[PDB]
Amino acid sequence: MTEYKLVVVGAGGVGKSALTIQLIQNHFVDEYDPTIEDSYRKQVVIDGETCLLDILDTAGQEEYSAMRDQYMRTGEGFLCVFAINNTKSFEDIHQYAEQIKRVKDSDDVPMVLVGNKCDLAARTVESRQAQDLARSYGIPYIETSAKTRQGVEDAFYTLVREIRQH
Numbered sequence: 001m002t003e004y005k006l007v008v009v010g011a012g013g014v015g016k017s018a019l020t021i022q023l024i025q026n027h028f029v030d031e032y033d034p035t036i037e038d039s040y041r042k043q044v045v046i047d048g049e050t051c052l053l054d055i056l057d058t059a060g061q062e063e064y065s066a067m068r069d070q071y072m073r074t075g076e077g078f079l080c081v082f083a084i085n086n087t088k089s090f091e092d093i094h095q096y097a098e099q100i101k102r103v104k105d106s107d108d109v110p111m112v113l114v115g116n117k118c119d120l121a122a123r124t125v126e127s128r129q130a131q132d133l134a135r136s137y138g139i140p141y142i143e144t145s146a147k148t149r150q151g152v153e154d155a156f157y158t159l160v161r162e163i164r165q166h
């Protein structure tokens with residue numbers, strides 16, 4: 001069957017692990033344990049296609065983000081995550097988008113922009129601000145909550161549908 005290699009990137013603490021774990025394991029991780037590099041694999045049906053999702057959960061902390069560059073190389077699509085209550089994480093999306101272009105050596109890489117923690121009310125990144133960034137990249141913007149599951153499946157499945165357009 002088809003295997004989709006997804007890579008989740010973004011600043012420390014934005015919810016990359018919580019998103020992946022909600023998708024794969026159907027529970028919310030409340031605690032904050034910084035990731036080095038973890039992998040998840042699950043067979044799913046997406047739009048009638050039996051798929052294997054291979055998901056790489058990467059480090060957002062600079063301290064633990066050593067061999068990030070090497071493990072991202074095989075990625076077929078990237079979830080670029082920021083948190084809607086963390087303006088700096090939004091501003092830093094460009095650093096990831098540019099690192100992605102490097103490891104893939106292409107200007108046309110399947111990507112989805114994700115604004116996570118949308119259950120929170122201390123919002124400092126407005127939807128329209130993120131829509132504009134996504135539009136500049138020619139990619140979708142989707143908001144998610146790893147806590148409530150809002151948008152979680154839609155974000156990962158949208159990334160698969162972006163990979164299929166390339």
Ligand SMILES: Nc1nc2c(ncn2[C@@H]2O[C@H](COP(=O)(O)OP(=O)(O)NP(=O)(O)O)[C@@H](O)[C@H]2O)c(=O)[nH]1
Nearest residue numbers: 012013014015016017018030034035060117145146
């Ligand atoms: N309210 C709320 N909290 C969230 C959400 N997603 C993650 N969190 C919280 O934010 C903290 C960090 O989440 P985590 O998934 O570990 O972040 P990360 O991006 O993987 N961090 P790292 O890059 O260091 O591995 C945790 O306390 C987690 O419960 C969300 O959608 N809503």
Ligand SMILES: [Ca+2]
Nearest residue numbers: 003004005076
């Ligand atoms: Ca593949």
Ligand SMILES: [Ca+2]
Nearest residue numbers: 031032033034
């Ligand atoms: Ca812990």
Ligand SMILES: [Mg+2]
Nearest residue numbers: 016017034035
């Ligand atoms: Mg993590």
Ligand SMILES: [Mg+2]
Nearest residue numbers: 124125126129
């Ligand atoms: Mg503002």
